[PDB]
Amino acid sequence: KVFREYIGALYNGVQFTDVPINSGVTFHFILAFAIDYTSAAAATNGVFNIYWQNSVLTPAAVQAIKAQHSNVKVMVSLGGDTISGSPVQFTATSVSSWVANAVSSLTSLINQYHLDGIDIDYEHFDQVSTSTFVSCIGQLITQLKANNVISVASIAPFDGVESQYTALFGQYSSVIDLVNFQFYSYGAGTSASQYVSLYNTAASKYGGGAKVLASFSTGGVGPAPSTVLSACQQLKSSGTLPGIFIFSADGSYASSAKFQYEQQAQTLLTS
Ligand SMILES: [Mg+2]
């Protein structure tokens, strides 16, 4: 019964408090994004900087939402698509130096913002080998778990990055709790039946489904949310739906539909 909500990357004023929270789900906010780049789009070799709207989504805001709702945790997502318009290319000076900077800088950030975990959301690999990427991230997650710094690690794959993320998951599944597979990568014409099929295929690549969350976008891309919710009811009826995530609170905030699908998703998971 996991529900997750990405939030903070658009700097559009959305707050944790705008998002419907059902007391009956395991609720995760995911701050988007921490990036190991400078604002001039220079890589920092794993020293993570803040690229969510942290003047609004402050440490006090994280502490407050968690104090009010005992079922809420807050994680941070790494990478994303762009940094000041440039692609966030995963890049490391060396594996060991990137890992040392990533573990330390994210530990500092997690302690500062009262966070519970990290989500891996790199998508550009034109400047790094897959082995290098997998080693960096696998070590990062393994160390944060061993150091008792995080309770939840996730990855956010889609088909275009299958080579990287299946290698990562197949190797580090014991320390990766959740697979935030991006089903909003598929077409807007996707039917509920097709979605169930697409979910089965993705689940087959990421351990069978126990850890693989369904998802949709509220930003006007991918399968229609109402259609995805229908597919999710079928997966739930089968006893094979671990949870749902939405990209994103910012999208919902700016949308005409507002947050009705966040609510519907959580109601589905708890009913
Ligand atoms: Mg994207």
PDB file of N, CA, C and O in Angstrom, residues 121-194:
ATOM      1  N   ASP A 121      17.185   8.733 -10.510  1.00  0.00           N
ATOM      2  CA  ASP A 121      16.430   9.185 -11.686  1.00  0.00           C
ATOM      3  C   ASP A 121      17.346   9.842 -12.714  1.00  0.00           C
ATOM      4  O   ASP A 121      16.971  10.828 -13.346  1.00  0.00           O
ATOM      5  N   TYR A 122      18.541   9.283 -12.890  1.00  0.00           N
ATOM      6  CA  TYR A 122      19.365   9.671 -14.027  1.00  0.00           C
ATOM      7  C   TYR A 122      18.829   9.065 -15.305  1.00  0.00           C
ATOM      8  O   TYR A 122      18.313   7.943 -15.299  1.00  0.00           O
ATOM      9  N   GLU A 123      18.961   9.794 -16.412  1.00  0.00           N
ATOM     10  CA  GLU A 123      18.523   9.258 -17.705  1.00  0.00           C
ATOM     11  C   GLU A 123      19.478   9.477 -18.870  1.00  0.00           C
ATOM     12  O   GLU A 123      19.220   8.993 -19.964  1.00  0.00           O
ATOM     13  N   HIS A 124      20.560  10.213 -18.650  1.00  0.00           N
ATOM     14  CA  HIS A 124      21.529  10.505 -19.712  1.00  0.00           C
ATOM     15  C   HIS A 124      22.849   9.860 -19.372  1.00  0.00           C
ATOM     16  O   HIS A 124      23.450  10.158 -18.338  1.00  0.00           O
ATOM     17  N   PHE A 125      23.306   8.996 -20.267  1.00  0.00           N
ATOM     18  CA  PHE A 125      24.474   8.160 -20.031  1.00  0.00           C
ATOM     19  C   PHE A 125      25.477   8.226 -21.167  1.00  0.00           C
ATOM     20  O   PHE A 125      26.227   7.286 -21.396  1.00  0.00           O
ATOM     21  N   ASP A 126      25.527   9.369 -21.837  1.00  0.00           N
ATOM     22  CA  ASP A 126      26.390   9.514 -23.006  1.00  0.00           C
ATOM     23  C   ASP A 126      27.864   9.725 -22.642  1.00  0.00           C
ATOM     24  O   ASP A 126      28.723   9.666 -23.524  1.00  0.00           O
ATOM     25  N   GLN A 127      28.153   9.968 -21.360  1.00  0.00           N
ATOM     26  CA  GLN A 127      29.511  10.278 -20.888  1.00  0.00           C
ATOM     27  C   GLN A 127      30.023   9.272 -19.849  1.00  0.00           C
ATOM     28  O   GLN A 127      31.011   9.531 -19.158  1.00  0.00           O
ATOM     29  N   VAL A 128      29.358   8.128 -19.749  1.00  0.00           N
ATOM     30  CA  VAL A 128      29.704   7.115 -18.763  1.00  0.00           C
ATOM     31  C   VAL A 128      29.339   5.716 -19.255  1.00  0.00           C
ATOM     32  O   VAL A 128      28.335   5.527 -19.935  1.00  0.00           O
ATOM     33  N   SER A 129      30.152   4.730 -18.901  1.00  0.00           N
ATOM     34  CA  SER A 129      29.802   3.343 -19.187  1.00  0.00           C
ATOM     35  C   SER A 129      28.737   2.861 -18.222  1.00  0.00           C
ATOM     36  O   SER A 129      28.594   3.372 -17.116  1.00  0.00           O
ATOM     37  N   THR A 130      27.998   1.853 -18.637  1.00  0.00           N
ATOM     38  CA  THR A 130      26.966   1.290 -17.788  1.00  0.00           C
ATOM     39  C   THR A 130      27.564   0.665 -16.525  1.00  0.00           C
ATOM     40  O   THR A 130      27.006   0.813 -15.438  1.00  0.00           O
ATOM     41  N   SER A 131      28.703  -0.013 -16.657  1.00  0.00           N
ATOM     42  CA  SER A 131      29.373  -0.591 -15.495  1.00  0.00           C
ATOM     43  C   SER A 131      29.750   0.479 -14.471  1.00  0.00           C
ATOM     44  O   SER A 131      29.607   0.264 -13.273  1.00  0.00           O
ATOM     45  N   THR A 132      30.233   1.624 -14.950  1.00  0.00           N
ATOM     46  CA  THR A 132      30.613   2.720 -14.067  1.00  0.00           C
ATOM     47  C   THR A 132      29.395   3.268 -13.337  1.00  0.00           C
ATOM     48  O   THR A 132      29.429   3.437 -12.126  1.00  0.00           O
ATOM     49  N   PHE A 133      28.314   3.516 -14.074  1.00  0.00           N
ATOM     50  CA  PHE A 133      27.068   3.984 -13.469  1.00  0.00           C
ATOM     51  C   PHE A 133      26.560   3.017 -12.397  1.00  0.00           C
ATOM     52  O   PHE A 133      26.239   3.424 -11.284  1.00  0.00           O
ATOM     53  N   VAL A 134      26.506   1.736 -12.731  1.00  0.00           N
ATOM     54  CA  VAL A 134      25.974   0.749 -11.813  1.00  0.00           C
ATOM     55  C   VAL A 134      26.824   0.663 -10.542  1.00  0.00           C
ATOM     56  O   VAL A 134      26.296   0.594  -9.432  1.00  0.00           O
ATOM     57  N   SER A 135      28.141   0.663 -10.700  1.00  0.00           N
ATOM     58  CA  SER A 135      29.032   0.631  -9.552  1.00  0.00           C
ATOM     59  C   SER A 135      28.821   1.841  -8.636  1.00  0.00           C
ATOM     60  O   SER A 135      28.718   1.698  -7.427  1.00  0.00           O
ATOM     61  N   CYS A 136      28.747   3.027  -9.229  1.00  0.00           N
ATOM     62  CA  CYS A 136      28.552   4.252  -8.442  1.00  0.00           C
ATOM     63  C   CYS A 136      27.255   4.200  -7.635  1.00  0.00           C
ATOM     64  O   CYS A 136      27.245   4.447  -6.428  1.00  0.00           O
ATOM     65  N   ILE A 137      26.158   3.895  -8.306  1.00  0.00           N
ATOM     66  CA  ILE A 137      24.854   3.941  -7.651  1.00  0.00           C
ATOM     67  C   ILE A 137      24.672   2.783  -6.669  1.00  0.00           C
ATOM     68  O   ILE A 137      24.129   2.970  -5.572  1.00  0.00           O
ATOM     69  N   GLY A 138      25.104   1.590  -7.061  1.00  0.00           N
ATOM     70  CA  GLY A 138      24.989   0.438  -6.184  1.00  0.00           C
ATOM     71  C   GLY A 138      25.748   0.650  -4.886  1.00  0.00           C
ATOM     72  O   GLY A 138      25.252   0.357  -3.789  1.00  0.00           O
ATOM     73  N   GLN A 139      26.955   1.187  -4.995  1.00  0.00           N
ATOM     74  CA  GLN A 139      27.759   1.496  -3.804  1.00  0.00           C
ATOM     75  C   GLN A 139      27.118   2.589  -2.955  1.00  0.00           C
ATOM     76  O   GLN A 139      27.108   2.508  -1.740  1.00  0.00           O
ATOM     77  N   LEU A 140      26.602   3.630  -3.606  1.00  0.00           N
ATOM     78  CA  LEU A 140      25.920   4.723  -2.911  1.00  0.00           C
ATOM     79  C   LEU A 140      24.758   4.180  -2.073  1.00  0.00           C
ATOM     80  O   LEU A 140      24.653   4.467  -0.883  1.00  0.00           O
ATOM     81  N   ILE A 141      23.898   3.382  -2.699  1.00  0.00           N
ATOM     82  CA  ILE A 141      22.732   2.851  -1.989  1.00  0.00           C
ATOM     83  C   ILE A 141      23.153   1.907  -0.861  1.00  0.00           C
ATOM     84  O   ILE A 141      22.628   1.964   0.253  1.00  0.00           O
ATOM     85  N   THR A 142      24.116   1.043  -1.161  1.00  0.00           N
ATOM     86  CA  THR A 142      24.579   0.045  -0.210  1.00  0.00           C
ATOM     87  C   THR A 142      25.172   0.724   1.023  1.00  0.00           C
ATOM     88  O   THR A 142      24.864   0.346   2.162  1.00  0.00           O
ATOM     89  N   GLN A 143      25.982   1.753   0.808  1.00  0.00           N
ATOM     90  CA  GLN A 143      26.562   2.491   1.928  1.00  0.00           C
ATOM     91  C   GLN A 143      25.518   3.264   2.734  1.00  0.00           C
ATOM     92  O   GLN A 143      25.579   3.277   3.963  1.00  0.00           O
ATOM     93  N   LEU A 144      24.572   3.932   2.069  1.00  0.00           N
ATOM     94  CA  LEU A 144      23.557   4.669   2.817  1.00  0.00           C
ATOM     95  C   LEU A 144      22.704   3.731   3.663  1.00  0.00           C
ATOM     96  O   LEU A 144      22.301   4.111   4.763  1.00  0.00           O
ATOM     97  N   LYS A 145      22.438   2.521   3.163  1.00  0.00           N
ATOM     98  CA  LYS A 145      21.715   1.516   3.935  1.00  0.00           C
ATOM     99  C   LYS A 145      22.544   1.003   5.107  1.00  0.00           C
ATOM    100  O   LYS A 145      22.052   0.953   6.244  1.00  0.00           O
ATOM    101  N   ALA A 146      23.796   0.649   4.841  1.00  0.00           N
ATOM    102  CA  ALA A 146      24.665   0.088   5.884  1.00  0.00           C
ATOM    103  C   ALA A 146      24.922   1.108   6.990  1.00  0.00           C
ATOM    104  O   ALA A 146      24.988   0.749   8.182  1.00  0.00           O
ATOM    105  N   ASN A 147      25.029   2.379   6.601  1.00  0.00           N
ATOM    106  CA  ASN A 147      25.274   3.466   7.548  1.00  0.00           C
ATOM    107  C   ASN A 147      24.009   3.877   8.316  1.00  0.00           C
ATOM    108  O   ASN A 147      24.076   4.776   9.149  1.00  0.00           O
ATOM    109  N   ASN A 148      22.871   3.239   8.022  1.00  0.00           N
ATOM    110  CA  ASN A 148      21.582   3.536   8.656  1.00  0.00           C
ATOM    111  C   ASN A 148      21.080   4.952   8.379  1.00  0.00           C
ATOM    112  O   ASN A 148      20.368   5.547   9.194  1.00  0.00           O
ATOM    113  N   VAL A 149      21.427   5.474   7.206  1.00  0.00           N
ATOM    114  CA  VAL A 149      21.093   6.842   6.835  1.00  0.00           C
ATOM    115  C   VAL A 149      19.714   6.919   6.154  1.00  0.00           C
ATOM    116  O   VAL A 149      19.001   7.936   6.276  1.00  0.00           O
ATOM    117  N   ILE A 150      19.346   5.853   5.445  1.00  0.00           N
ATOM    118  CA  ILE A 150      18.060   5.779   4.731  1.00  0.00           C
ATOM    119  C   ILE A 150      17.356   4.476   5.040  1.00  0.00           C
ATOM    120  O   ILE A 150      18.006   3.467   5.317  1.00  0.00           O
ATOM    121  N   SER A 151      16.025   4.515   4.987  1.00  0.00           N
ATOM    122  CA  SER A 151      15.194   3.319   5.085  1.00  0.00           C
ATOM    123  C   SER A 151      14.659   2.866   3.730  1.00  0.00           C
ATOM    124  O   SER A 151      14.260   1.720   3.596  1.00  0.00           O
ATOM    125  N   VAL A 152      14.643   3.744   2.725  1.00  0.00           N
ATOM    126  CA  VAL A 152      14.044   3.400   1.413  1.00  0.00           C
ATOM    127  C   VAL A 152      14.927   3.877   0.275  1.00  0.00           C
ATOM    128  O   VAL A 152      15.280   5.047   0.224  1.00  0.00           O
ATOM    129  N   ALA A 153      15.281   2.962  -0.626  1.00  0.00           N
ATOM    130  CA  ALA A 153      15.958   3.306  -1.875  1.00  0.00           C
ATOM    131  C   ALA A 153      15.087   2.841  -3.031  1.00  0.00           C
ATOM    132  O   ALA A 153      14.488   1.751  -2.975  1.00  0.00           O
ATOM    133  N   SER A 154      15.014   3.676  -4.064  1.00  0.00           N
ATOM    134  CA  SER A 154      14.258   3.361  -5.267  1.00  0.00           C
ATOM    135  C   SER A 154      14.993   3.791  -6.517  1.00  0.00           C
ATOM    136  O   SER A 154      15.940   4.580  -6.467  1.00  0.00           O
ATOM    137  N   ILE A 155      14.548   3.223  -7.633  1.00  0.00           N
ATOM    138  CA  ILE A 155      15.039   3.588  -8.955  1.00  0.00           C
ATOM    139  C   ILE A 155      13.835   3.993  -9.784  1.00  0.00           C
ATOM    140  O   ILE A 155      12.732   3.516  -9.530  1.00  0.00           O
ATOM    141  N   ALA A 156      14.053   4.856 -10.777  1.00  0.00           N
ATOM    142  CA  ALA A 156      12.957   5.384 -11.604  1.00  0.00           C
ATOM    143  C   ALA A 156      13.182   5.133 -13.109  1.00  0.00           C
ATOM    144  O   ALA A 156      13.380   6.070 -13.879  1.00  0.00           O
ATOM    145  N   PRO A 157      13.152   3.862 -13.532  1.00  0.00           N
ATOM    146  CA  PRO A 157      13.494   3.555 -14.919  1.00  0.00           C
ATOM    147  C   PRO A 157      12.351   3.727 -15.903  1.00  0.00           C
ATOM    148  O   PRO A 157      11.196   3.875 -15.515  1.00  0.00           O
ATOM    149  N   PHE A 158      12.706   3.687 -17.181  1.00  0.00           N
ATOM    150  CA  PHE A 158      11.753   3.543 -18.278  1.00  0.00           C
ATOM    151  C   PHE A 158      12.491   2.773 -19.373  1.00  0.00           C
ATOM    152  O   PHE A 158      13.675   2.458 -19.218  1.00  0.00           O
ATOM    153  N   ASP A 159      11.820   2.436 -20.466  1.00  0.00           N
ATOM    154  CA  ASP A 159      12.418   1.476 -21.404  1.00  0.00           C
ATOM    155  C   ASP A 159      13.717   1.968 -22.033  1.00  0.00           C
ATOM    156  O   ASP A 159      14.642   1.183 -22.250  1.00  0.00           O
ATOM    157  N   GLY A 160      13.790   3.269 -22.306  1.00  0.00           N
ATOM    158  CA  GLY A 160      14.972   3.867 -22.926  1.00  0.00           C
ATOM    159  C   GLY A 160      16.253   3.745 -22.122  1.00  0.00           C
ATOM    160  O   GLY A 160      17.353   3.886 -22.680  1.00  0.00           O
ATOM    161  N   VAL A 161      16.121   3.481 -20.821  1.00  0.00           N
ATOM    162  CA  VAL A 161      17.273   3.261 -19.943  1.00  0.00           C
ATOM    163  C   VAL A 161      17.273   1.858 -19.316  1.00  0.00           C
ATOM    164  O   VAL A 161      17.843   1.637 -18.254  1.00  0.00           O
ATOM    165  N   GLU A 162      16.677   0.894 -20.021  1.00  0.00           N
ATOM    166  CA  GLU A 162      16.584  -0.490 -19.546  1.00  0.00           C
ATOM    167  C   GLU A 162      17.935  -1.134 -19.272  1.00  0.00           C
ATOM    168  O   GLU A 162      18.106  -1.814 -18.258  1.00  0.00           O
ATOM    169  N   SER A 163      18.894  -0.922 -20.178  1.00  0.00           N
ATOM    170  CA  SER A 163      20.214  -1.522 -20.027  1.00  0.00           C
ATOM    171  C   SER A 163      20.864  -1.137 -18.695  1.00  0.00           C
ATOM    172  O   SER A 163      21.402  -1.981 -17.972  1.00  0.00           O
ATOM    173  N   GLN A 164      20.789   0.144 -18.361  1.00  0.00           N
ATOM    174  CA  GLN A 164      21.399   0.650 -17.138  1.00  0.00           C
ATOM    175  C   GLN A 164      20.670   0.171 -15.895  1.00  0.00           C
ATOM    176  O   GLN A 164      21.285  -0.328 -14.952  1.00  0.00           O
ATOM    177  N   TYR A 165      19.357   0.343 -15.867  1.00  0.00           N
ATOM    178  CA  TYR A 165      18.625   0.072 -14.635  1.00  0.00           C
ATOM    179  C   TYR A 165      18.358  -1.406 -14.361  1.00  0.00           C
ATOM    180  O   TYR A 165      18.303  -1.808 -13.203  1.00  0.00           O
ATOM    181  N   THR A 166      18.198  -2.228 -15.403  1.00  0.00           N
ATOM    182  CA  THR A 166      18.085  -3.666 -15.143  1.00  0.00           C
ATOM    183  C   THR A 166      19.399  -4.248 -14.607  1.00  0.00           C
ATOM    184  O   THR A 166      19.394  -5.134 -13.750  1.00  0.00           O
ATOM    185  N   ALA A 167      20.529  -3.754 -15.111  1.00  0.00           N
ATOM    186  CA  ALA A 167      21.830  -4.171 -14.594  1.00  0.00           C
ATOM    187  C   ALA A 167      21.942  -3.781 -13.124  1.00  0.00           C
ATOM    188  O   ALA A 167      22.352  -4.584 -12.285  1.00  0.00           O
ATOM    189  N   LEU A 168      21.554  -2.544 -12.819  1.00  0.00           N
ATOM    190  CA  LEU A 168      21.577  -2.050 -11.446  1.00  0.00           C
ATOM    191  C   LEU A 168      20.660  -2.876 -10.543  1.00  0.00           C
ATOM    192  O   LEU A 168      21.087  -3.348  -9.490  1.00  0.00           O
ATOM    193  N   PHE A 169      19.408  -3.082 -10.956  1.00  0.00           N
ATOM    194  CA  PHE A 169      18.465  -3.812 -10.115  1.00  0.00           C
ATOM    195  C   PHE A 169      18.852  -5.276  -9.910  1.00  0.00           C
ATOM    196  O   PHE A 169      18.744  -5.803  -8.805  1.00  0.00           O
ATOM    197  N   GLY A 170      19.298  -5.928 -10.980  1.00  0.00           N
ATOM    198  CA  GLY A 170      19.630  -7.350 -10.924  1.00  0.00           C
ATOM    199  C   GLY A 170      20.789  -7.637  -9.988  1.00  0.00           C
ATOM    200  O   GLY A 170      20.907  -8.743  -9.454  1.00  0.00           O
ATOM    201  N   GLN A 171      21.623  -6.615  -9.796  1.00  0.00           N
ATOM    202  CA  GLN A 171      22.819  -6.672  -8.970  1.00  0.00           C
ATOM    203  C   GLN A 171      22.604  -6.246  -7.507  1.00  0.00           C
ATOM    204  O   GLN A 171      23.258  -6.764  -6.601  1.00  0.00           O
ATOM    205  N   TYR A 172      21.689  -5.300  -7.284  1.00  0.00           N
ATOM    206  CA  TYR A 172      21.509  -4.656  -5.982  1.00  0.00           C
ATOM    207  C   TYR A 172      20.064  -4.744  -5.490  1.00  0.00           C
ATOM    208  O   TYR A 172      19.608  -3.928  -4.686  1.00  0.00           O
ATOM    209  N   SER A 173      19.338  -5.776  -5.920  1.00  0.00           N
ATOM    210  CA  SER A 173      17.929  -5.864  -5.540  1.00  0.00           C
ATOM    211  C   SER A 173      17.716  -5.930  -4.031  1.00  0.00           C
ATOM    212  O   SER A 173      16.724  -5.419  -3.528  1.00  0.00           O
ATOM    213  N   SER A 174      18.655  -6.516  -3.289  1.00  0.00           N
ATOM    214  CA  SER A 174      18.490  -6.606  -1.842  1.00  0.00           C
ATOM    215  C   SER A 174      18.464  -5.251  -1.138  1.00  0.00           C
ATOM    216  O   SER A 174      17.944  -5.150  -0.025  1.00  0.00           O
ATOM    217  N   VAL A 175      19.025  -4.216  -1.762  1.00  0.00           N
ATOM    218  CA  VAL A 175      19.022  -2.886  -1.145  1.00  0.00           C
ATOM    219  C   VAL A 175      18.154  -1.875  -1.900  1.00  0.00           C
ATOM    220  O   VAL A 175      18.060  -0.716  -1.497  1.00  0.00           O
ATOM    221  N   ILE A 176      17.495  -2.311  -2.969  1.00  0.00           N
ATOM    222  CA  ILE A 176      16.566  -1.451  -3.684  1.00  0.00           C
ATOM    223  C   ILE A 176      15.150  -1.898  -3.345  1.00  0.00           C
ATOM    224  O   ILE A 176      14.722  -2.971  -3.739  1.00  0.00           O
ATOM    225  N   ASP A 177      14.423  -1.055  -2.633  1.00  0.00           N
ATOM    226  CA  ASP A 177      13.117  -1.420  -2.105  1.00  0.00           C
ATOM    227  C   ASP A 177      11.993  -1.276  -3.104  1.00  0.00           C
ATOM    228  O   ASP A 177      11.040  -2.046  -3.050  1.00  0.00           O
ATOM    229  N   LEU A 178      12.085  -0.271  -3.974  1.00  0.00           N
ATOM    230  CA  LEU A 178      10.969   0.089  -4.858  1.00  0.00           C
ATOM    231  C   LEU A 178      11.465   0.478  -6.237  1.00  0.00           C
ATOM    232  O   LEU A 178      12.519   1.108  -6.377  1.00  0.00           O
ATOM    233  N   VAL A 179      10.706   0.065  -7.248  1.00  0.00           N
ATOM    234  CA  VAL A 179      10.979   0.409  -8.631  1.00  0.00           C
ATOM    235  C   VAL A 179       9.858   1.337  -9.094  1.00  0.00           C
ATOM    236  O   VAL A 179       8.711   0.908  -9.295  1.00  0.00           O
ATOM    237  N   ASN A 180      10.202   2.618  -9.228  1.00  0.00           N
ATOM    238  CA  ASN A 180       9.293   3.654  -9.727  1.00  0.00           C
ATOM    239  C   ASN A 180       9.306   3.635 -11.263  1.00  0.00           C
ATOM    240  O   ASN A 180       9.823   4.556 -11.893  1.00  0.00           O
ATOM    241  N   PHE A 181       8.769   2.583 -11.870  1.00  0.00           N
ATOM    242  CA  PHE A 181       8.801   2.486 -13.316  1.00  0.00           C
ATOM    243  C   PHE A 181       7.889   3.569 -13.898  1.00  0.00           C
ATOM    244  O   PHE A 181       6.755   3.723 -13.469  1.00  0.00           O
ATOM    245  N   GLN A 182       8.403   4.330 -14.857  1.00  0.00           N
ATOM    246  CA  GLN A 182       7.676   5.457 -15.428  1.00  0.00           C
ATOM    247  C   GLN A 182       6.734   5.030 -16.555  1.00  0.00           C
ATOM    248  O   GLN A 182       7.103   5.059 -17.732  1.00  0.00           O
ATOM    249  N   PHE A 183       5.505   4.676 -16.201  1.00  0.00           N
ATOM    250  CA  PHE A 183       4.533   4.191 -17.197  1.00  0.00           C
ATOM    251  C   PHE A 183       3.955   5.310 -18.050  1.00  0.00           C
ATOM    252  O   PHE A 183       3.364   5.047 -19.102  1.00  0.00           O
ATOM    253  N   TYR A 184       4.181   6.547 -17.625  1.00  0.00           N
ATOM    254  CA  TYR A 184       3.805   7.722 -18.403  1.00  0.00           C
ATOM    255  C   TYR A 184       4.743   7.965 -19.587  1.00  0.00           C
ATOM    256  O   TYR A 184       4.541   8.916 -20.348  1.00  0.00           O
ATOM    257  N   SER A 185       5.761   7.110 -19.744  1.00  0.00           N
ATOM    258  CA  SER A 185       6.569   7.057 -20.968  1.00  0.00           C
ATOM    259  C   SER A 185       5.776   6.469 -22.147  1.00  0.00           C
ATOM    260  O   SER A 185       6.181   6.643 -23.296  1.00  0.00           O
ATOM    261  N   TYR A 186       4.684   5.757 -21.873  1.00  0.00           N
ATOM    262  CA  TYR A 186       3.884   5.145 -22.935  1.00  0.00           C
ATOM    263  C   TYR A 186       2.857   6.133 -23.482  1.00  0.00           C
ATOM    264  O   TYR A 186       2.671   7.222 -22.932  1.00  0.00           O
ATOM    265  N   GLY A 187       2.211   5.757 -24.581  1.00  0.00           N
ATOM    266  CA  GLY A 187       1.359   6.688 -25.309  1.00  0.00           C
ATOM    267  C   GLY A 187       0.056   7.055 -24.628  1.00  0.00           C
ATOM    268  O   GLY A 187      -0.521   6.268 -23.874  1.00  0.00           O
ATOM    269  N   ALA A 188      -0.421   8.263 -24.933  1.00  0.00           N
ATOM    270  CA  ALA A 188      -1.689   8.769 -24.403  1.00  0.00           C
ATOM    271  C   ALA A 188      -2.899   7.936 -24.828  1.00  0.00           C
ATOM    272  O   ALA A 188      -3.934   7.982 -24.184  1.00  0.00           O
ATOM    273  N   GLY A 189      -2.755   7.178 -25.913  1.00  0.00           N
ATOM    274  CA  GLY A 189      -3.799   6.268 -26.377  1.00  0.00           C
ATOM    275  C   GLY A 189      -3.871   4.926 -25.670  1.00  0.00           C
ATOM    276  O   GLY A 189      -4.742   4.127 -25.966  1.00  0.00           O
ATOM    277  N   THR A 190      -2.961   4.670 -24.727  1.00  0.00           N
ATOM    278  CA  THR A 190      -2.926   3.390 -24.032  1.00  0.00           C
ATOM    279  C   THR A 190      -4.246   3.062 -23.327  1.00  0.00           C
ATOM    280  O   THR A 190      -4.735   3.849 -22.518  1.00  0.00           O
ATOM    281  N   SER A 191      -4.820   1.900 -23.629  1.00  0.00           N
ATOM    282  CA  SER A 191      -6.037   1.445 -22.950  1.00  0.00           C
ATOM    283  C   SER A 191      -5.724   0.809 -21.590  1.00  0.00           C
ATOM    284  O   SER A 191      -4.571   0.486 -21.279  1.00  0.00           O
ATOM    285  N   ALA A 192      -6.751   0.583 -20.777  1.00  0.00           N
ATOM    286  CA  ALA A 192      -6.548  -0.109 -19.507  1.00  0.00           C
ATOM    287  C   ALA A 192      -5.960  -1.525 -19.677  1.00  0.00           C
ATOM    288  O   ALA A 192      -5.063  -1.917 -18.937  1.00  0.00           O
ATOM    289  N   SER A 193      -6.454  -2.264 -20.675  1.00  0.00           N
ATOM    290  CA  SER A 193      -5.955  -3.604 -20.984  1.00  0.00           C
ATOM    291  C   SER A 193      -4.481  -3.575 -21.392  1.00  0.00           C
ATOM    292  O   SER A 193      -3.676  -4.376 -20.922  1.00  0.00           O
ATOM    293  N   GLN A 194      -4.142  -2.646 -22.276  1.00  0.00           N
ATOM    294  CA  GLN A 194      -2.756  -2.466 -22.701  1.00  0.00           C
ATOM    295  C   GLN A 194      -1.859  -2.097 -21.517  1.00  0.00           C
ATOM    296  O   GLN A 194      -0.734  -2.578 -21.419  1.00  0.00           O
TER     297      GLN A 194
END
